[PDB]
Amino acid sequence: TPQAASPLASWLSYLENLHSKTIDLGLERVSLVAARLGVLKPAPFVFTVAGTNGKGTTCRTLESILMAAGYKVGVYSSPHLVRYTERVRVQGQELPESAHTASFAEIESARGDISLTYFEYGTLSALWLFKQAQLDVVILEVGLGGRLDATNIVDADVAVVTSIALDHTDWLGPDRESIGREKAGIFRSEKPAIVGEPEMPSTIADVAQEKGALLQRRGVEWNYSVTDHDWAFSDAHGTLENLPLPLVPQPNAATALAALRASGLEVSENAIRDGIASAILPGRFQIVSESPRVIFDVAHNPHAAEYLTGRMKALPKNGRVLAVIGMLHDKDIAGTLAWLKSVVDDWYCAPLEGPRGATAEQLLEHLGNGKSFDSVAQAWDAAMADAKAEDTVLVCGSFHTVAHVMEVIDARRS
Numbered sequence: 001t002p003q004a005a006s007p008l009a010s011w012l013s014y015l016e017n018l019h020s021k022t023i024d025l026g027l028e029r030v031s032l033v034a035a036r037l038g039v040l041k042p043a044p045f046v047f048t049v050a051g052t053n054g055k056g057t058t059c060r061t062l063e064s065i066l067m068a069a070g071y072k073v074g075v076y077s078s079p080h081l082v083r084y085t086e087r088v089r090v091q092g093q094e095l096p097e098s099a100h101t102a103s104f105a106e107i108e109s110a111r112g113d114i115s116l117t118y119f120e121y122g123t124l125s126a127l128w129l130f131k132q133a134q135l136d137v138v139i140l141e142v143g144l145g146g147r148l149d150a151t152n153i154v155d156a157d158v159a160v161v162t163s164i165a166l167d168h169t170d171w172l173g174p175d176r177e178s179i180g181r182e183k184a185g186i187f188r189s190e191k192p193a194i195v196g197e198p199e200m201p202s203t204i205a206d207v208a209q210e211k212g213a214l215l216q217r218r219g220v221e222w223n224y225s226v227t228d229h230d231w232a233f234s235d236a237h238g239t240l241e242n243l244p245l246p247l248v249p250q251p252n253a254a255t256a257l258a259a260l261r262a263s264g265l266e267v268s269e270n271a272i273r274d275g276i277a278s279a280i281l282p283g284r285f286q287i288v289s290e291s292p293r294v295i296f297d298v299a300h301n302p303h304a305a306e307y308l309t310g311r312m313k314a315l316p317k318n319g320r321v322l323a324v325i326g327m328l329h330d331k332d333i334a335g336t337l338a339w340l341k342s343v344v345d346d347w348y349c350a351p352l353e354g355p356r357g358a359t360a361e362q363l364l365e366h367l368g369n370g371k372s373f374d375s376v377a378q379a380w381d382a383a384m385a386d387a388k389a390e391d392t393v394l395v396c397g398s399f400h401t402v403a404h405v406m407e408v409i410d411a412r413r414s
């Protein structure tokens with residue numbers, strides 16, 4: 001059993017093995033420990049963000065605007081690209097590793113004999129770190145689903161649903177309706193329930209009615225329009241024009257703005273512009289370099305692949321598209337690749353080290369074309385060796401693939 005003085009790495013290895021099951025959805029055990037720790041209300045204002053895709057970037061947008069508005073903001077995000085500490089930001093910055101291990105030590109003593117999973121532990125830690133930080137606003141990214149996610153032990157002041165599509169059917173049910181119901185579990189009585197999914201499953205309205213939540217959805221209570229050079233937003237309180245084209249997915253920037261406006265928080269139009277203009281998240285349609293155009297995107301399900309495919313087709317015409325890909329077997333690899341195949345010319349497949357990582361040959365079979373490599377680094381090197389300046393190299397499929405290339409590039413700078 002690690003202690004406050006133990007390295008973070010030891011703590012993470014310990015958390016990875018503490019509970020009988022890796023993922024164990026449910027609120028009881030975790031709520032009881034949160035109750036002992038006094039971390040159930042981490043800040044006077046909390047945004048909780050659920051959805052199939054778009055959670056990370058919607059949270060980043062909220063963080064960016066609120067910081068511009070001068071609020072002390074904390075953000076809980078998952079999963080992480082390279083380092084675990086990425087999961088907890090205060091004022092847009094990671095916290096010291098020793099703050100994390102101290103928090104873990106507090107949870108370890110407070111839990112007594114109550115067992116907690118890795119994500120439950122990490123959630124309690126983020127909450128405790130936020131409480132210590134005396135923040136004005138805390139933004140919680142839901143881990144998985146909503147209703148039974150560890151983050152749902154906190155009562156959000158504004159609940160957000162970014163999109164509803166097929167992912168995590170093992171836990172959330174086989175269709176958009178079952179998935180929508182689970183995501184909507186973060187809604188609360190008399191609190192805004194901001195829905196950015198344009199094709200809202202009816203179950204989301206059911207849950208909003210069951211809870212007495214204040215549903216405000218895209219296409220109804222609020223909306224946005226786009227141009228090649230900017231965008232506009234509208235809701236019950238008015239309209240905003242010539243907004244900065246987002247550096248995060250367009251739908252999420254609009255969802256964040258809707259949630260921000262529904263919150264009643266005091267935020268100027270300039271803080272909104274500055275926030276949107278500066279909101280960006282590594283690995284989310286990230287333009288890394290040019291000649292050739294290098295793009296990183298963590299899409300890992302067909303809805304995200306379809307969106308990515310749409311962004312790829314919107315890129316300047318000409319040149320070849322070479323993809324460096326690695327994926328986990330727990331995702332709909334076939335459906336994800338079906339979309340990507342329509343835009344990719346040359347495939348460079350790599351295995352993902354793992355209990356759940358697909359091998360290069362497994363990916364190759366889905367493609368019907370392409371080359372296999374022994375590692376992401378080698379696939380990346382082969383693509384970049386083949387790419388001409390007019391081409392685009394897309395690193396995709398998983399957080400793992402993107403992270404591997406980010407690390408190879410950074411290491412080469414030394």
Ligand SMILES: Nc1nc2ncc(CNc3ccc(C(=O)OP(=O)(O)O)cc3)nc2c(=O)[nH]1
Nearest residue numbers: 023024025026078079117119143144148149150
């Ligand atoms: N009550 C609990 N909730 C909970 N929620 C999530 C998890 C596992 N951690 C995850 C983190 C991220 C994702 C994910 O898909 O993240 P993105 O969609 O943003 O990419 C899934 C699981 N365990 C428990 C768990 O064990 N208990």
Ligand SMILES: Nc1ncnc2c1ncn2[C@@H]1O[C@H](COP(=O)(O)OP(=O)(O)O)[C@@H](O)[C@H]1O
Nearest residue numbers: 052053054055056057249251284298299304307
């Ligand atoms: N509204 C959206 N619709 C479809 N796909 C999206 C949307 N937002 C993001 N994505 C996809 O999901 C990936 C990660 O997005 P992120 O904003 O971190 O959301 P999440 O935390 O839910 O995974 C992106 O790189 C993109 O491939």
Ligand SMILES: [Mg+2]
Nearest residue numbers: 052144167168
């Ligand atoms: Mg997910």
Ligand SMILES: [Mg+2]
Nearest residue numbers: 055056078079
């Ligand atoms: Mg996320």
